[PDB]
């Protein structure tokens, strides 16, 4: 829209509030709206004499034409060149100073809290920290002397706006709404693009980003965004000038963004020899900032975060898959292409368009096919990439180093580029960086890798703000912090369990399936009773029972080898917990326990499954949560065939589940010196990442009230010190978990005609999960009763086992 650009920026340069149409603008974003006053360049973007003081300029008379100053008044004016005190007052560059612990904020009088400066680097791959260390001394000083992770995991897709906005909000893209760098919203009937004006409309941007959270709570925020044409040196000088403002106008939070190294990375690849110079240049910018802070006596006052959005992979246009090689109908689709694919109908008036036929035509068609198609609800749940109408139903997960495109003309265009990003967020090349330096961060401390969704909470903790509701786990990053830790309380248990005893006779049941229990001494008779009353429960429930965080009716069921929380509403366990020692033996299913299920005399027939429904349902079979293969004794093996341990399983999924239970659990116990396993169903028919209520379930076992899970989870816990057995661990724990999709075929696994040893593990790795993912999906809270700090437990709950080298 039109602006009066006739007015002036005099005494307004980089003003901290964005003035409306009646005026022309002088803020750091004015150029991006073509709204600056005519004299913005002249007054606000000075360049004369460059960015550095020289000996000749020391004690110059102030000339207001200069980009920066070397006059005696510059310190109190806050506009010296960042090297002024080095060149003119015999001081050292910050990077040449030994690091010294910052135990408290050393701030000028009138500072109410340490400022936070967020320095974001686009496309800064995690491995640049080591690989570029010789050319980035300032960054290396921040890293070594402050708090750093070896890498930080971005969100999917590993694109720029989704990640930058996740850093801003603590939200998954599905929640904040920036699901891609390009998007179509069918409700608005509008398109969002990198180029163009639509991206500036507020309706795209969900959640509450840090600058708003700060403003709403009375903390002044620096104008976060810089028009691209403003040179980095000017952005630095501007932040330092703002930090020199009076107490009642000075921001408490600042942001710097660099388009490098992403710009060069796309052209040259992540490690192209051309990459050295951009890394040197970013390091020089960091050194300007630190030297400038040091001049202002703020270098032991501010907290600095050095963070990236995502990494960068080698991708060249010869590694392109074309949908025109697969689809005969290729002109009837719209593709959002590149390092991910999203497909929809070109016209909503095409009644032929059929997603099922599209998926089929894209599935395992070429031997080394470098993408895989998914309906979005079938994507790995760790990606949290489905619950937004801007995400098309059909998704293509693209292999690292490749692109997908609709037709070969479209690519001639990725042949002028050698790098890209966007792939699955567990891919090593997509990982990025985190360093925190300052009074509130720890000193010379390495922390484990963590996800970028956690940072918003921490930025809030650094500024004294209450975060808006978000997808971080607040407290899981307390180990990065010297002070201002957030100490939450465990959620309160909402439903208390029943503990049913023996209440039903065998003949009350009509299961249609019933084992012929033929076997029939008081040493063992009291033993069986004590096991049913929970005498072995300390062995199998190592960390307390899970708490149920919603209103329901459920029963705790005790057994020799396993304990369960059985839902009377869903007719199956919510959780089954058991411990397998390193010594445990695997056994096979005896004939008196084949093709049959036993009534559980603690649970009414009306609250039990039955076998007739499985017989009648020609598509659905059943498996067991506690694995009968791992029963401790032949007497205990009967418990594994109780109807209360049965769950609905498609025969295709049974292949996966049996291999897990019969092969992998024991392998893990051998490798990890025992494991504790908690397994159960998940119902997420509306693909929102949250536990379904009973009225959301779309599929039941034929002719019954038995709901069919969308997924099966397992949480596998052992001692981080693997010289201690899982059931006698004195210290921190180790965990890996999965959320496997409960699918009626193995179309996902292109090698599934082979033996399970050639494909099931690969599937499970792709569907690796955090405990916290499982908690959202089940309304359960785990690790209630450990010896450990609750924040250490929150860290453990956010861990993801990625399987990357
Ligand atoms: C990740 O973390 C996030 C954040 O915690 C989790 O996301 C939250 O999840 C909740 C459950 O799905 C969801 O609760 C909704 O809220 C509905 C109100 O939503 C609107 O207002 C929200 C609050 O706005 C105000 O406050 C904030 C505070 O900071 C300010 O910044 C605001 O400016 C306001 O002052 C607002 O956040 C929300 O934003 C969404 O929608 C926008 C479009 O308007 C998008 O721009 C934005 O990106 C958000 O979009 C996401 O979320 C929506 C779902 O809301 C989703 O569809 C999108 O795909 C996208 O994912 C809205 O503007 C409320 O109406 C809902 O109530 C129904 O269900 C409840 C259950 O208790 C019923 O009891 C209730 O009766 C009600 O039923 C009625 O309506 C039904 C639905 O239409 C209808 O069918 C029925 O018959 C009834 O009539 C429910 O409470 C939060 O909205 C959501 N927040 C965000 C930001 O996403 C997320 O779950 C976490 N993920 C995981 C995996 O853990
Ligand atoms: N990869 S690619 O897309 O092929 C490539 C294309 C070319 N390209 C550009 O044109 C850049 C993209 C971009 C520019 C210019 C300026 N810019 C911001 O000023 C910004 C900062 C921010 O910072 C958010 C901060 C929140 C706190 O944590 C640190 C980040 N957030 C947001 C928007 C999300 C709101 C925006 C983002 C680079 C990327
Ligand atoms: N230059 S750029 O980086 O492409 C540009 C992106 C858009 N942008 C925004 O402020 C949006 C608008 C809005 C946000 C983020 C949060 N809410 C309302 C300015 C920076
Ligand atoms: Ca980026
Ligand atoms: Ca759900
Ligand atoms: Cl995209
Ligand atoms: K069946
Ligand atoms: Na297959
Ligand atoms: Zn990029």
């Amino acid at each position: 829209p039109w602006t009066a650009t006739s007015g002036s920026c005099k005494g307004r340069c980089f003003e901290l509030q964005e003035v409306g149409p009646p005026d022309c603008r002088c803020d750091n974003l004015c150029k991006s709206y073509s709204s600056c006053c005519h004299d913005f360049d002249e007054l606000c973007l000075k360049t004369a004499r460059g960015w550095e003081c020289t000996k000749d300029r020391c004690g110059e008379v102030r000339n207001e034409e200069n980009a920066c100053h070397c006059s005696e008044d510059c310190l109190s004016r806050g506009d010296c060149c960042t090297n002024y005190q080095v060149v003119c007052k015999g001081e050292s560059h910050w990077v040449d100073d030994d690091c010294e612990e910052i135990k408290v904020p050393e701030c000028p009088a009138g500072f109410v809290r340490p400022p936070l400066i967020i320095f974001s680097v686009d496309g800064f791959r995690a491995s640049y920290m080591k690989k570029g260390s010789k050319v980035m001394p300032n960054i290396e000083k921040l890293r070594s002397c402050g708090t750093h992770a070896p890498y930080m995991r971005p969100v999917y897709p590993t694109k720029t706006f989704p990640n930058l906005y996740t850093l801003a909000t603590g939200l998954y893209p599905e929640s904040h709404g920036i699901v891609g760098n390009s998007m179509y919203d069918p409700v608005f009937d509008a398109s969002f693009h990198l180029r163009g004006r639509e991206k500036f409309n507020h309706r795209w941007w969900g959640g509450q980003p840090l600058w708003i959270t700060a403003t709403k709570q009375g903390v002044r925020a620096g104008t976060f965004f810089w028009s691209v044409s403003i040179p980095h040196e000017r952005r630095i000088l501007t932040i330092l000038q703002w930090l020199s403002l009076p107490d009642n106008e000075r921001p408490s939070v600042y942001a710097f963004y660099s388009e490098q190294p992403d710009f060069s990375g796309h052209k040259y690849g992540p490690f192209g020899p051309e990459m050295t110079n951009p890394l040197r240049e970013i390091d020089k910018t960091v050194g300007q900032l630190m030297d400038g802070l040091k001049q202002l006596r703020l270098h032991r006052c501010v907290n600095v975060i050095f963070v990236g959005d995502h990494g960068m992979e080698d991708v060249t246009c010869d590694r392109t898959e074309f949908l025109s090689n697969y689809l005969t109908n290729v002109d009837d689709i719209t593709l959002v292409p590149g390092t991910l694919g999203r497909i929809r109908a070109k016209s909503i008036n095409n009644s032929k368009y059929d997603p099922k036929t599209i998926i089929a035509a894209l599935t395992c068609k070429k031997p080394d096919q470098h993408f895989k198609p998914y309906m979005k609800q079938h994507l790995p749940k760790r990606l949290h990439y489905a619950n937004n109408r801007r995400i098309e139903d059909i998704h293509l997960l693209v292999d690292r180093r490749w692109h997908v495109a609709r037709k070969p003309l479209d690519v001639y265009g990725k042949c002028f580029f050698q790098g890209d990003h966007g792939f699955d967020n567990k891919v090593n090349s997509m990982q990025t960086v985190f360093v925190g330096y300052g009074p509130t961060f720890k000193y010379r401390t390495k922390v484990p890798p963590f996800e970028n969704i956690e940072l918003y909470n921490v930025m809030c903790d650094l500024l004294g703000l209450k975060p808006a509701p978000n997808n971080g786990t607040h407290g899981s990053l307390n180990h990065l912090l010297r002070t201002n830790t957030f100490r939450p309380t465990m959620p309160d248990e909402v439903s208390r369990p029943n503990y049913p005893g023996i209440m039903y006779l065998q003949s009350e049941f009509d299961l249609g399936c019933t084992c012929d229990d033929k076997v029939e001494n008081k040493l063992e008779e009291l033993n069986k009773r004590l096991h049913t009353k929970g005498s072995t429960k300390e062995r199998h429930l190592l960390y307390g029972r899970p708490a149920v965080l919603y209103r329901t009716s459920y029963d705790i069921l005790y057994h020799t080898d396993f304990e369960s929380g059985y839902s009377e509403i869903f007719l199956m366990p919510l959780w089954t917990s058991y411990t397998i020692s390193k010594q445990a033996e695997v056994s096979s299913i005896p004939e008196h326990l084949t093709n049959c299920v036993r009534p559980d005399v603690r649970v009414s027939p009306g609250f039990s499954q039955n076998c007739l429904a499985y017989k009648n349902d020609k598509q659905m079979s059943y498996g067991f949560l506690f694995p009968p293969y791992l029963s401790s004794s032949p007497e205990a093996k009967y418990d594994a065939f109780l109807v209360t341990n049965m769950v609905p399983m498609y025969p295709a999924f049974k292949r996966v589940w049996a291999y897990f239970q019969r092969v992998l659990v024991k392998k893990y116990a051998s490798e990890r010196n025992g494991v504790n396993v908690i397994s159960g169903p998940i119902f997420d028919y509306n693909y929102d990442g949250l536990r379904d209520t009973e009225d959301e379930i779309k599929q039941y076992v034929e002719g019954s009230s038995i709901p069919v899970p969308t997924h099966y989870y397992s949480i596998i816990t052992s001692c981080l010190d693997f010289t201690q057995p899982a059931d006698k661990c004195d210290g921190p724990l180790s965990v890996s978990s999965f959320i496997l999709p409960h699918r009626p075929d193995n179309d996902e696994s292109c090698n599934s005609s082979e033996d399970e040893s050639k494909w099931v593990e690969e599937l499970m790795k792709m569907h690796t999960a955090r405990v916290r993912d499982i908690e959202h999906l089940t309304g359960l809270d785990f690790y209630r009763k450990t010896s450990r700090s609750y924040s250490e437990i929150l860290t453990l709950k956010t861990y993801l086992h990625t399987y990357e080298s």
Side-chain angles (χ1 to χ4, degrees), residues 537-725:
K537 76 193 158 144
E538 335 301 343
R539 182 67 198 307
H540 299 303
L541 269 186
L542 298 179
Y543 324 106
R545 66 176 180 81
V548 175
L549 306 189
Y550 61 96
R551 175 76 257 155
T552 201
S553 180
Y554 80 104
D555 301 300
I556 299 299
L557 308 176
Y558 296 119
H559 326 71
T560 305
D561 295 341
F562 67 102
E563 333 302 332
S564 67
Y566 176 86
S567 168
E568 289 184 349
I569 305 308
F570 282 69
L571 312 181
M572 62 186 74
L574 298 178
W575 56 264
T576 301
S577 181
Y578 61 98
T579 297
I580 302 302
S581 72
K582 185 184 185 170
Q583 301 60 63
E585 210 173 318
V586 175
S587 47
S588 61
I589 294 162
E591 286 301 287
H592 66 279
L593 294 169
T594 293
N595 292 331
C596 65
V597 153
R598 301 174 60 246
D600 187 328
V601 291
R602 304 167 289 198
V603 176
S604 75
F607 298 137
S608 296
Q609 293 177 45
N610 69 75
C611 199
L612 186 52
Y614 294 103
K615 277 179 189 192
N616 289 340
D617 194 316
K618 296 294 177 305
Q619 317 302 318
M620 189 64 65
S621 189
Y622 66 88
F624 297 104
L625 286 176
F626 174 74
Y629 319 98
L630 287 165
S631 60
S632 60
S633 70
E635 169 164 348
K637 189 176 300 269
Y638 286 91
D639 294 338
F641 295 85
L642 288 165
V643 70
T644 49
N645 187 41
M646 188 180 39
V647 286
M649 294 191 169
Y650 289 116
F653 189 74
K654 292 178 55 179
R655 295 182 63 198
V656 171
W657 193 246
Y659 186 79
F660 168 60
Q661 293 190 320
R662 189 184 54 74
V663 178
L664 297 172
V665 172
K666 190 57 235 181
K667 170 183 160 225
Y668 301 152
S670 309
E671 295 172 340
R672 300 167 58 169
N673 195 358
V675 287
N676 177 259
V677 179
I678 303 173
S679 299
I682 275 158
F683 304 82
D684 194 21
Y685 280 97
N686 64 353
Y687 50 89
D688 66 355
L690 310 170
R691 172 196 59 95
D692 285 0
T693 57
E694 31 174 328
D695 62 2
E696 294 177 323
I697 302 308
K698 297 174 62 61
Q699 180 179 349
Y700 289 85
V701 180
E702 176 180 304
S704 82
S705 275
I706 307 165
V708 172
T710 60
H711 301 79
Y712 283 98
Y713 69 86
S714 298
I715 297 163
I716 308 175
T717 312
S718 70
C719 200
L720 182 63
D721 178 356
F722 59 75
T723 70
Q724 308 204 298

Side-chain angles (χ1 to χ4, degrees), residues 122-123 159-160 257 262 309-310 421:
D122 201 332
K159 298 287 201 162
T160 296
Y257 170 80
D262 175 90
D309 56 0
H310 52 71
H421 54 88

Side-chain angles (χ1 to χ4, degrees), residues 227-245:
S227 297
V228 59
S229 56
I230 303 167
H232 292 185
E233 303 83 342
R234 173 63 52 207
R235 311 177 187 189
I236 298 311
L237 286 166
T238 297
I239 284 167
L240 294 164
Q241 186 100 80
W242 289 330
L243 277 164
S244 303
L245 287 169

Side-chain angles (χ1 to χ4, degrees), residues 329-335 343-350 353 406:
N329 58 289
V330 77
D331 292 321
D332 292 337
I333 58 149
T334 294
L335 175 71
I343 294 171
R344 61 185 190 277
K346 182 162 175 54
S347 175
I348 68 155
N349 301 141
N350 179 359
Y353 177 85
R406 196 170 62 100

Side-chain angles (χ1 to χ4, degrees), residues 175-289:
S175 291
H176 65 53
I178 313 300
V179 306
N181 280 346
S182 307
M183 305 183 272
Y184 176 65
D185 190 310
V187 165
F188 308 150
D189 182 44
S191 290
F192 179 108
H193 293 291
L194 172 59
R195 301 285 140 197
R197 296 202 54 65
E198 179 58 44
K199 73 171 181 296
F200 295 96
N201 185 317
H202 292 191
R203 67 191 172 166
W204 293 100
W205 306 92
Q208 187 187 83
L210 185 69
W211 52 95
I212 298 308
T213 303
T215 300
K216 281 210 202 299
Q217 295 178 51
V219 176
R220 268 180 285 278
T223 29
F224 272 42
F225 307 113
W226 300 92
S227 297
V228 59
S229 56
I230 303 167
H232 292 185
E233 303 83 342
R234 173 63 52 207
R235 311 177 187 189
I236 298 311
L237 286 166
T238 297
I239 284 167
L240 294 164
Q241 186 100 80
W242 289 330
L243 277 164
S244 303
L245 287 169
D247 301 334
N248 77 335
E249 315 157 51
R250 174 178 73 240
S252 275
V253 61
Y254 301 83
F256 172 92
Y257 170 80
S258 168
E259 306 80 0
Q260 289 284 34
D262 175 90
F263 180 82
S264 297
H266 282 290
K267 293 179 93 303
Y268 300 122
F271 304 106
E274 300 91 343
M275 295 303 302
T276 294
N277 287 334
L279 297 179
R280 293 187 183 280
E281 291 303 316
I282 297 158
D283 197 76
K284 182 173 168 141
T285 302
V286 178
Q288 286 172 6
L289 176 62

Side-chain angles (χ1 to χ4, degrees), residues 746-752:
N746 290 291
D747 286 359
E748 188 175 1
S749 295
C750 295
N751 295 341
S752 63

